[PDB]
Protein backbone atom coordinates (compact mmCIF):
# COMPACT_ATOMS: atom_id res chain seq x y z
CA UNK A 1 0.00 0.00 0.00
CA UNK A 2 1.61 3.22 -1.24
CA UNK A 3 -1.36 5.52 -1.87
CA UNK A 4 -3.73 4.33 0.84
CA UNK A 5 -4.90 5.51 4.24
CA UNK A 6 -4.63 4.13 7.75
CA UNK A 7 -7.09 1.43 8.80
CA UNK A 8 -9.24 1.65 11.91
CA UNK A 9 -8.39 -0.57 14.88
CA UNK A 10 -10.18 -3.85 14.16
CA UNK A 11 -11.15 -3.10 10.55
CA UNK A 12 -9.01 -6.04 9.33
CA UNK A 13 -8.91 -8.76 12.00
CA UNK A 14 -7.79 -11.48 9.55
CA UNK A 15 -4.45 -9.76 8.81
CA UNK A 16 -1.64 -11.50 10.72
CA UNK A 17 1.84 -10.02 11.05
CA UNK A 18 4.57 -12.64 10.77
CA UNK A 19 7.94 -11.95 12.39
CA UNK A 20 11.25 -13.71 11.72
CA UNK A 21 13.84 -12.88 14.37
CA UNK A 22 12.12 -9.76 15.66
CA UNK A 23 11.36 -8.28 12.23
CA UNK A 24 8.19 -8.45 10.14
CA UNK A 25 8.70 -9.90 6.66
CA UNK A 26 5.35 -10.90 5.13
CA UNK A 27 1.80 -10.68 6.40
CA UNK A 28 -0.61 -13.59 6.47
CA UNK A 29 -4.37 -14.29 6.42
CA UNK A 30 -6.10 -16.00 9.34
CA UNK A 31 -8.24 -18.75 7.82
CA UNK A 32 -8.83 -21.23 10.65
CA UNK A 33 -8.27 -21.45 14.40
CA UNK A 34 -4.66 -22.59 13.87
CA UNK A 35 -3.91 -22.18 10.14
CA UNK A 36 -2.69 -19.20 8.12
CA UNK A 37 -2.14 -18.42 4.44
CA UNK A 38 0.99 -16.57 3.31
CA UNK A 39 2.99 -16.15 0.12
CA UNK A 40 5.41 -19.01 -0.50
CA UNK A 41 8.29 -16.71 -1.51
CA UNK A 42 9.07 -15.30 1.95
CA UNK A 43 8.88 -18.69 3.71
CA UNK A 44 10.92 -20.24 0.86
CA UNK A 45 14.02 -21.47 2.68
CA UNK A 46 12.66 -20.84 6.19
CA UNK A 47 10.20 -23.75 6.55
CA UNK A 48 12.91 -25.91 8.17
CA UNK A 49 12.65 -24.05 11.51
CA UNK A 50 8.99 -23.06 12.02
CA UNK A 51 9.69 -21.91 15.59
CA UNK A 52 11.44 -18.81 14.19
CA UNK A 53 8.10 -17.47 12.90
CA UNK A 54 5.93 -15.65 15.45
CA UNK A 55 2.38 -14.91 14.27
CA UNK A 56 1.08 -11.66 15.78
CA UNK A 57 -2.71 -11.99 15.65
CA UNK A 58 -5.00 -8.97 15.66
CA UNK A 59 -2.20 -6.44 15.25
CA UNK A 60 -3.11 -2.79 14.67
CA UNK A 61 0.04 -0.71 15.31
CA UNK A 62 3.50 -2.22 14.87
CA UNK A 63 4.75 -0.43 18.03
CA UNK A 64 1.97 -1.51 20.41
CA UNK A 65 2.63 -5.22 20.93
CA UNK A 66 1.66 -4.81 24.61
CA UNK A 67 -1.97 -4.43 23.55
CA UNK A 68 -4.55 -6.51 25.46
CA UNK A 69 -5.99 -7.60 22.08
CA UNK A 70 -2.71 -8.77 20.52
CA UNK A 71 -2.38 -12.56 20.79
CA UNK A 72 1.10 -13.78 19.80
CA UNK A 73 1.49 -17.36 18.60
CA UNK A 74 4.25 -19.62 17.30
CA UNK A 75 4.50 -21.65 14.10
CA UNK A 76 5.10 -25.40 14.15
CA UNK A 77 4.55 -26.34 10.49
CA UNK A 78 5.03 -24.51 7.18
CA UNK A 79 3.50 -26.35 4.21
CA UNK A 80 4.66 -24.80 0.93
CA UNK A 81 2.49 -25.55 -2.10
CA UNK A 82 3.95 -28.49 -4.07
CA UNK A 83 3.35 -26.83 -7.45
CA UNK A 84 5.41 -23.78 -6.42
CA UNK A 85 8.14 -22.53 -8.75
CA UNK A 86 10.26 -19.54 -7.71
CA UNK A 87 11.56 -18.98 -11.25
CA UNK A 88 8.05 -18.76 -12.73
CA UNK A 89 6.50 -17.31 -9.53
CA UNK A 90 3.51 -19.62 -10.02
CA UNK A 91 1.49 -21.27 -7.24
CA UNK A 92 2.94 -18.75 -4.76
CA UNK A 93 0.96 -19.81 -1.69
CA UNK A 94 1.79 -21.51 1.61
CA UNK A 95 0.00 -22.41 4.84
CA UNK A 96 1.53 -22.04 8.31
CA UNK A 97 0.19 -23.96 11.30
CA UNK A 98 -0.11 -22.14 14.63
CA UNK A 99 1.32 -23.54 17.85
CA UNK A 100 -1.84 -23.28 19.97
CA UNK A 101 -5.46 -22.42 19.24
CA UNK A 102 -6.60 -18.79 19.36
CA UNK A 103 -10.07 -17.72 20.48
CA UNK A 104 -12.19 -15.53 18.21
CA UNK A 105 -12.70 -11.92 19.31
CA UNK A 106 -13.96 -8.68 17.78
CA UNK A 107 -10.37 -7.87 16.73
CA UNK A 108 -9.37 -11.42 15.67
CA UNK A 109 -11.58 -13.11 13.08
CA UNK A 110 -10.78 -15.76 10.46
CA UNK A 111 -11.00 -14.81 6.80
CA UNK A 112 -13.42 -16.44 4.37
CA UNK A 113 -12.65 -18.90 1.57
CA UNK A 114 -13.80 -18.56 -2.07
CA UNK A 115 -15.98 -21.40 -3.31
CA UNK A 116 -15.10 -23.45 -6.38
CA UNK A 117 -15.56 -21.70 -9.74
CA UNK A 118 -16.32 -18.20 -8.43
CA UNK A 119 -16.11 -15.73 -11.31
CA UNK A 120 -14.67 -12.41 -10.12
CA UNK A 121 -15.57 -9.85 -12.81
CA UNK A 122 -12.85 -7.39 -13.84
CA UNK A 123 -13.12 -3.79 -12.73
CA UNK A 124 -14.53 -4.87 -9.36
CA UNK A 125 -12.87 -3.08 -6.45
CA UNK A 126 -11.06 -5.21 -3.87
CA UNK A 127 -9.43 -4.03 -0.65
CA UNK A 128 -5.93 -4.94 0.52
CA UNK A 129 -4.06 -4.53 3.81
CA UNK A 130 -0.71 -5.19 5.45
CA UNK A 131 2.14 -3.25 7.07
CA UNK A 132 3.86 -2.72 3.73
CA UNK A 133 5.90 0.20 2.42
CA UNK A 134 4.36 3.53 1.42
CA UNK A 135 7.09 4.15 -1.17
CA UNK A 136 9.50 1.96 -3.13
CA UNK A 137 12.76 3.56 -1.93
CA UNK A 138 11.68 4.35 1.60
CA UNK A 139 10.63 2.90 4.96
CA UNK A 140 7.69 0.78 6.07
CA UNK A 141 4.59 2.15 7.80
CA UNK A 142 3.87 1.67 11.50
CA UNK A 143 0.07 1.84 11.29
CA UNK A 144 -1.85 -0.90 9.47
CA UNK A 145 -2.33 0.56 6.00
CA UNK A 146 -5.19 -0.23 3.64
CA UNK A 147 -6.09 0.47 0.03
CA UNK A 148 -8.58 -0.45 -2.70
CA UNK A 149 -7.63 -1.79 -6.13
CA UNK A 150 -9.84 -3.05 -8.99
CA UNK A 151 -9.51 -6.47 -10.59
CA UNK A 152 -8.06 -6.85 -14.08
CA UNK A 153 -8.53 -9.63 -16.61
CA UNK A 154 -5.76 -12.13 -17.28
CA UNK A 155 -5.48 -11.07 -20.94
CA UNK A 156 -5.14 -7.37 -20.09
CA UNK A 157 -2.60 -8.20 -17.37
CA UNK A 158 -0.57 -10.34 -19.78
CA UNK A 159 -0.64 -7.50 -22.31
CA UNK A 160 0.54 -5.11 -19.58
CA UNK A 161 3.07 -7.59 -18.11
CA UNK A 162 5.16 -9.01 -20.98
CA UNK A 163 8.21 -9.72 -18.80
CA UNK A 164 6.37 -12.42 -16.82
CA UNK A 165 4.06 -15.33 -17.68
CA UNK A 166 0.64 -14.70 -16.12
CA UNK A 167 -0.87 -18.19 -15.88
CA UNK A 168 -4.42 -19.17 -14.90
CA UNK A 169 -3.43 -19.12 -11.20
CA UNK A 170 -2.76 -15.35 -11.09
CA UNK A 171 -5.45 -12.69 -10.60
CA UNK A 172 -4.01 -9.23 -11.16
CA UNK A 173 -5.27 -6.04 -9.53
CA UNK A 174 -4.27 -2.41 -9.96
CA UNK A 175 -5.24 1.03 -11.21
CA UNK A 176 -4.54 2.35 -14.71
CA UNK A 177 -2.40 5.33 -13.63
CA UNK A 178 -0.86 3.54 -10.64
CA UNK A 179 -0.50 5.50 -7.42
CA UNK A 180 -2.26 2.86 -5.31
CA UNK A 181 -0.69 -0.61 -5.24
CA UNK A 182 0.95 -3.01 -2.82
CA UNK A 183 4.70 -2.77 -2.24
CA UNK A 184 7.49 -4.49 -0.25
CA UNK A 185 6.46 -5.87 3.18
CA UNK A 186 2.92 -6.58 1.87
CA UNK A 187 3.56 -9.95 0.12
CA UNK A 188 1.83 -12.95 1.79
CA UNK A 189 -1.18 -10.77 2.72
CA UNK A 190 -4.80 -10.93 1.38
CA UNK A 191 -6.79 -9.50 -1.57
CA UNK A 192 -10.21 -9.08 0.03
CA UNK A 193 -13.37 -8.50 -2.01
CA UNK A 194 -16.74 -7.87 -0.37
CA UNK A 195 -19.58 -10.16 -1.45
CA UNK A 196 -22.92 -10.59 0.36
CA UNK A 197 -21.61 -8.62 3.37
CA UNK A 198 -18.66 -11.06 3.51
CA UNK A 199 -14.97 -10.44 2.81
CA UNK A 200 -13.66 -13.37 0.76
CA UNK A 201 -10.02 -14.21 0.01
CA UNK A 202 -9.70 -13.70 -3.75
CA UNK A 203 -5.91 -13.37 -3.81
CA UNK A 204 -2.55 -13.34 -2.03
CA UNK A 205 0.13 -10.82 -2.99
CA UNK A 206 2.64 -12.83 -5.04
CA UNK A 207 4.88 -10.49 -7.06
CA UNK A 208 4.91 -7.52 -9.42
CA UNK A 209 7.12 -5.46 -11.72
CA UNK A 210 7.32 -2.40 -9.45
CA UNK A 211 5.13 -0.60 -6.93
CA UNK A 212 3.61 2.88 -7.26
CA UNK A 213 4.19 2.77 -11.02
CA UNK A 214 1.63 3.82 -13.66
CA UNK A 215 0.18 1.01 -15.79
CA UNK A 216 1.89 -1.69 -13.69
CA UNK A 217 -0.61 -3.72 -11.66
CA UNK A 218 0.32 -6.18 -8.96
CA UNK A 219 -0.07 -9.94 -9.39
CA UNK A 220 -1.96 -11.94 -6.76
CA UNK A 221 -2.09 -15.72 -6.35
CA UNK A 222 -5.63 -16.83 -7.21
CA UNK A 223 -6.87 -18.54 -4.05
CA UNK A 224 -9.95 -19.69 -5.98
CA UNK A 225 -7.76 -22.41 -7.51
CA UNK A 226 -6.10 -23.53 -4.24
CA UNK A 227 -9.41 -23.86 -2.37
CA UNK A 228 -9.35 -27.65 -2.05
CA UNK A 229 -5.64 -27.67 -1.17
CA UNK A 230 -6.32 -25.29 1.72
CA UNK A 231 -9.47 -27.10 2.86
CA UNK A 232 -7.54 -30.39 2.94
CA UNK A 233 -5.54 -29.02 5.89
CA UNK A 234 -8.34 -27.34 7.87
CA UNK A 235 -10.20 -30.61 8.52
Amino acid sequence: IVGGSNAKEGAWPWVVGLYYGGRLLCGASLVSSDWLVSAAHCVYGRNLEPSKWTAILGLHMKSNLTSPQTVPRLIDEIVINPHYNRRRKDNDIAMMHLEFKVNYTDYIQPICLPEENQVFPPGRNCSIAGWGTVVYQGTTANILQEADVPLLSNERCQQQMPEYNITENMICAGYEEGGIDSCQGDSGGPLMCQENNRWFLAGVTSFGYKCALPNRPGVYARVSRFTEWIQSFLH
Binding site: G45, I80, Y84, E115, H235
Partner: protein, 261 residues
Amino acid sequence: CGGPFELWEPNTTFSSTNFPNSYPNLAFCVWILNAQKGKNIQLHFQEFDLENINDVVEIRDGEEADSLLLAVYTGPGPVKDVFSTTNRMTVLLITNDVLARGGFKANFTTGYHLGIPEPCKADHFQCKNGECVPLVNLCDGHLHCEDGSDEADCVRFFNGTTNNNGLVRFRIQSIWHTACAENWTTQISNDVCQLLGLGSGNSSKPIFPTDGGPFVKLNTAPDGHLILTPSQQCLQDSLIRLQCNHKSCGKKLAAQDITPK
Protein backbone atom coordinates in the same frame (compact mmCIF):
# COMPACT_ATOMS: atom_id res chain seq x y z
CA CYS B 1 25.98 -23.25 -13.93
CA GLY B 2 27.58 -26.02 -15.98
CA GLY B 3 27.66 -28.92 -13.55
CA PRO B 4 26.70 -32.54 -14.21
CA PHE B 5 23.37 -33.89 -15.44
CA GLU B 6 21.21 -37.05 -15.55
CA LEU B 7 22.68 -39.87 -13.45
CA TRP B 8 21.71 -43.53 -13.13
CA GLU B 9 22.15 -46.57 -10.89
CA PRO B 10 25.80 -47.43 -11.82
CA ASN B 11 27.06 -44.21 -10.22
CA THR B 12 24.48 -42.73 -7.79
CA THR B 13 27.19 -40.48 -6.35
CA PHE B 14 27.75 -36.75 -6.84
CA SER B 15 28.86 -33.63 -5.03
CA SER B 16 27.43 -30.23 -5.94
CA THR B 17 30.21 -28.71 -8.04
CA ASN B 18 33.22 -27.76 -5.86
CA PHE B 19 33.12 -30.16 -2.86
CA PRO B 20 36.45 -29.07 -1.25
CA ASN B 21 35.11 -26.56 1.26
CA SER B 22 34.06 -23.83 -1.19
CA TYR B 23 31.53 -23.75 -4.07
CA PRO B 24 31.35 -20.88 -6.60
CA ASN B 25 28.78 -18.14 -6.17
CA LEU B 26 25.88 -17.50 -8.57
CA ALA B 27 25.75 -21.26 -9.19
CA PHE B 28 22.68 -22.94 -10.68
CA CYS B 29 23.09 -26.69 -11.23
CA VAL B 30 20.61 -29.48 -11.93
CA TRP B 31 20.99 -33.20 -11.17
CA ILE B 32 18.13 -35.03 -12.91
CA LEU B 33 18.06 -38.27 -10.92
CA ASN B 34 16.59 -40.95 -13.19
CA ALA B 35 15.30 -44.46 -12.51
CA GLN B 36 13.27 -47.23 -14.12
CA LYS B 37 9.55 -47.11 -14.87
CA GLY B 38 7.89 -47.80 -11.52
CA LYS B 39 10.84 -47.03 -9.20
CA ASN B 40 11.04 -43.90 -7.07
CA ILE B 41 14.17 -42.13 -5.77
CA GLN B 42 15.43 -41.93 -2.17
CA LEU B 43 17.92 -39.07 -1.78
CA HIS B 44 20.06 -39.30 1.37
CA PHE B 45 22.55 -36.56 2.24
CA GLN B 46 25.77 -37.74 3.89
CA GLU B 47 26.75 -34.09 4.46
CA PHE B 48 24.91 -30.78 4.10
CA ASP B 49 26.62 -27.52 5.13
CA LEU B 50 25.29 -24.55 3.15
CA GLU B 51 24.62 -20.87 3.82
CA ASN B 52 21.41 -19.34 5.19
CA ILE B 53 18.07 -18.83 3.40
CA ASN B 54 19.97 -17.05 0.61
CA ASP B 55 21.36 -20.44 -0.51
CA VAL B 56 18.89 -23.33 -0.77
CA VAL B 57 18.61 -26.75 -2.40
CA GLU B 58 15.34 -27.27 -4.26
CA ILE B 59 14.56 -30.99 -4.64
CA ARG B 60 11.77 -31.64 -7.15
CA ASP B 61 9.76 -34.57 -8.53
CA GLY B 62 9.09 -33.28 -12.03
CA GLU B 63 8.87 -36.22 -14.47
CA GLU B 64 7.80 -33.48 -16.91
CA ALA B 65 7.96 -29.70 -17.32
CA ASP B 66 5.46 -29.18 -14.47
CA SER B 67 7.88 -29.96 -11.67
CA LEU B 68 6.50 -30.35 -8.15
CA LEU B 69 8.29 -29.51 -4.88
CA LEU B 70 9.54 -31.99 -2.27
CA ALA B 71 11.87 -30.13 0.10
CA VAL B 72 13.86 -26.90 0.32
CA TYR B 73 16.94 -27.64 2.41
CA THR B 74 19.34 -24.96 3.64
CA GLY B 75 21.58 -24.06 6.55
CA PRO B 76 24.16 -26.25 8.29
CA GLY B 77 22.39 -29.31 9.67
CA PRO B 78 21.61 -32.97 8.97
CA VAL B 79 18.66 -33.00 6.60
CA LYS B 80 16.20 -35.87 6.30
CA ASP B 81 15.80 -38.22 3.35
CA VAL B 82 13.64 -37.27 0.36
CA PHE B 83 11.45 -39.99 -1.17
CA SER B 84 10.30 -39.30 -4.72
CA THR B 85 7.10 -40.56 -6.37
CA THR B 86 7.90 -40.76 -10.09
CA ASN B 87 11.01 -42.18 -11.76
CA ARG B 88 12.61 -38.71 -12.01
CA MET B 89 13.93 -36.32 -9.36
CA THR B 90 15.39 -32.88 -10.06
CA VAL B 91 17.78 -31.22 -7.60
CA LEU B 92 18.51 -27.50 -7.95
CA LEU B 93 21.30 -25.56 -6.22
CA ILE B 94 20.43 -21.86 -5.99
CA THR B 95 23.27 -19.79 -4.52
CA ASN B 96 23.85 -16.13 -3.71
CA ASP B 97 26.77 -13.93 -4.79
CA VAL B 98 28.68 -13.76 -1.48
CA LEU B 99 29.58 -15.85 1.59
CA ALA B 100 30.15 -19.20 -0.11
CA ARG B 101 29.82 -22.18 2.23
CA GLY B 102 31.38 -25.64 1.94
CA GLY B 103 28.84 -27.70 0.02
CA PHE B 104 26.82 -30.89 0.31
CA LYS B 105 27.07 -34.51 -0.82
CA ALA B 106 24.35 -37.11 -1.35
CA ASN B 107 23.83 -40.56 -2.87
CA PHE B 108 20.48 -41.94 -4.00
CA THR B 109 19.26 -45.44 -4.84
CA THR B 110 16.38 -46.90 -6.85
CA GLY B 111 13.78 -49.01 -5.08
CA TYR B 112 10.12 -50.06 -4.93
CA HIS B 113 7.81 -47.84 -2.85
CA LEU B 114 10.60 -46.42 -0.70
CA GLY B 115 9.57 -44.27 2.25
CA ILE B 116 5.90 -45.27 2.14
CA PRO B 117 5.57 -48.16 4.62
CA GLU B 118 3.90 -51.39 3.59
CA PRO B 119 0.20 -51.33 4.54
CA CYS B 120 -0.60 -53.82 7.29
CA LYS B 121 -2.91 -56.62 6.13
CA ALA B 122 -5.84 -58.24 7.99
CA ASP B 123 -8.32 -55.35 7.60
CA HIS B 124 -5.98 -52.71 9.04
CA PHE B 125 -6.92 -49.20 7.91
CA GLN B 126 -3.80 -47.16 7.12
CA CYS B 127 -3.96 -43.41 7.69
CA LYS B 128 -1.60 -40.82 6.21
CA ASN B 129 1.08 -41.13 8.90
CA GLY B 130 1.59 -44.85 8.18
CA GLU B 131 0.27 -46.54 11.32
CA CYS B 132 -2.49 -49.16 11.28
CA VAL B 133 -5.87 -48.74 12.98
CA PRO B 134 -8.48 -51.36 11.99
CA LEU B 135 -11.55 -49.98 13.77
CA VAL B 136 -10.34 -48.15 16.91
CA ASN B 137 -10.34 -44.72 15.23
CA LEU B 138 -12.40 -45.11 12.01
CA CYS B 139 -14.59 -42.02 12.53
CA ASP B 140 -15.53 -42.67 16.16
CA GLY B 141 -14.19 -39.63 18.04
CA HIS B 142 -10.56 -40.48 18.91
CA LEU B 143 -7.15 -39.14 17.86
CA HIS B 144 -5.01 -42.22 17.18
CA CYS B 145 -3.53 -41.04 13.88
CA GLU B 146 -1.54 -37.85 14.44
CA ASP B 147 -2.18 -36.66 10.87
CA GLY B 148 -5.93 -36.61 11.54
CA SER B 149 -6.65 -39.01 8.68
CA ASP B 150 -8.34 -41.35 11.17
CA GLU B 151 -11.09 -38.70 11.47
CA ALA B 152 -11.12 -37.97 7.73
CA ASP B 153 -14.18 -37.62 5.49
CA CYS B 154 -16.81 -40.20 6.43
CA VAL B 155 -19.92 -37.98 6.29
CA ARG B 156 -20.57 -35.83 3.23
CA PHE B 157 -23.32 -34.33 1.09
CA PHE B 158 -25.24 -36.53 -1.35
CA ASN B 159 -27.09 -35.02 -4.33
CA GLY B 160 -26.46 -31.46 -3.19
CA THR B 161 -27.73 -28.49 -5.16
CA THR B 162 -25.34 -25.87 -3.76
CA ASN B 163 -22.06 -26.21 -1.86
CA ASN B 164 -23.45 -26.18 1.69
CA ASN B 165 -26.43 -28.38 0.85
CA GLY B 166 -27.21 -32.05 0.30
CA LEU B 167 -27.91 -35.20 2.26
CA VAL B 168 -26.33 -36.43 5.51
CA ARG B 169 -24.86 -39.67 4.15
CA PHE B 170 -22.66 -41.25 6.82
CA ARG B 171 -20.21 -44.17 6.77
CA ILE B 172 -19.79 -46.62 9.65
CA GLN B 173 -16.62 -48.31 8.37
CA SER B 174 -16.65 -48.68 4.56
CA ILE B 175 -20.20 -48.50 3.20
CA TRP B 176 -21.43 -44.96 2.54
CA HIS B 177 -25.06 -44.85 3.68
CA THR B 178 -27.57 -42.09 4.41
CA ALA B 179 -29.40 -41.41 7.68
CA CYS B 180 -33.05 -41.38 8.73
CA ALA B 181 -35.01 -38.77 10.72
CA GLU B 182 -36.40 -40.85 13.58
CA ASN B 183 -35.37 -38.39 16.34
CA TRP B 184 -33.77 -35.64 14.27
CA THR B 185 -33.39 -32.43 16.29
CA THR B 186 -31.60 -29.11 15.82
CA GLN B 187 -28.90 -30.06 18.35
CA ILE B 188 -27.65 -33.08 16.39
CA SER B 189 -28.23 -31.04 13.22
CA ASN B 190 -25.73 -28.35 14.20
CA ASP B 191 -23.46 -31.06 15.61
CA VAL B 192 -23.32 -32.78 12.21
CA CYS B 193 -22.88 -29.39 10.53
CA GLN B 194 -19.87 -28.78 12.78
CA LEU B 195 -18.52 -32.24 11.95
CA LEU B 196 -18.72 -31.33 8.24
CA GLY B 197 -16.64 -28.20 8.89
CA LEU B 198 -19.55 -25.79 8.30
CA GLY B 199 -21.47 -23.63 10.77
CA SER B 200 -24.78 -24.42 12.46
CA GLY B 201 -27.85 -26.20 11.14
CA ASN B 202 -30.73 -24.57 9.31
CA SER B 203 -34.09 -25.69 7.92
CA SER B 204 -33.99 -29.47 8.28
CA LYS B 205 -36.65 -30.67 5.84
CA PRO B 206 -37.45 -34.36 5.28
CA ILE B 207 -38.72 -35.02 1.76
CA PHE B 208 -39.16 -38.71 0.88
CA PRO B 209 -37.32 -42.06 1.06
CA THR B 210 -35.33 -42.89 -2.07
CA ASP B 211 -32.05 -44.57 -1.02
CA GLY B 212 -31.99 -48.32 -0.46
CA GLY B 213 -28.70 -48.39 1.43
CA PRO B 214 -28.28 -49.30 5.10
CA PHE B 215 -29.59 -46.02 6.50
CA VAL B 216 -28.64 -45.25 10.11
CA LYS B 217 -30.86 -43.81 12.84
CA LEU B 218 -29.02 -40.84 14.34
CA ASN B 219 -29.64 -40.32 18.07
CA THR B 220 -28.15 -38.30 20.92
CA ALA B 221 -26.79 -39.04 24.39
CA PRO B 222 -25.88 -36.84 27.38
CA ASP B 223 -22.24 -37.98 27.17
CA GLY B 224 -21.58 -35.62 24.26
CA HIS B 225 -20.78 -38.04 21.46
CA LEU B 226 -23.25 -39.13 18.78
CA ILE B 227 -24.30 -42.79 18.98
CA LEU B 228 -25.49 -43.92 15.53
CA THR B 229 -26.89 -47.45 15.23
CA PRO B 230 -26.82 -48.72 11.61
CA SER B 231 -30.07 -50.66 11.88
CA GLN B 232 -31.85 -51.37 8.58
CA GLN B 233 -35.46 -51.42 9.76
CA CYS B 234 -37.83 -48.45 9.48
CA LEU B 235 -41.28 -47.58 8.16
CA GLN B 236 -42.06 -44.44 6.11
CA ASP B 237 -38.43 -43.34 6.15
CA SER B 238 -37.51 -39.69 5.63
CA LEU B 239 -34.23 -38.24 4.35
CA ILE B 240 -33.04 -35.04 6.02
CA ARG B 241 -32.20 -32.27 3.54
CA LEU B 242 -29.32 -30.85 5.54
CA GLN B 243 -28.62 -27.12 5.10
CA CYS B 244 -25.66 -25.78 7.09
CA ASN B 245 -24.60 -22.14 7.20
CA HIS B 246 -21.02 -20.96 6.84
CA LYS B 247 -18.52 -20.52 9.67
CA SER B 248 -17.18 -17.23 11.09
CA CYS B 249 -16.50 -15.79 7.64
CA GLY B 250 -15.12 -12.35 6.84
CA LYS B 251 -17.61 -10.32 8.88
CA LYS B 252 -16.10 -7.29 10.63
CA LEU B 253 -17.35 -7.39 14.23
CA ALA B 254 -15.22 -4.51 15.55
CA ALA B 255 -16.28 -0.86 15.91
CA GLN B 256 -15.87 0.18 12.28
CA ASP B 257 -17.64 2.90 10.31
CA ILE B 258 -18.30 3.90 6.68
CA THR B 259 -16.11 6.74 5.39
CA PRO B 260 -15.26 7.42 1.71
CA LYS B 261 -11.61 8.15 2.50
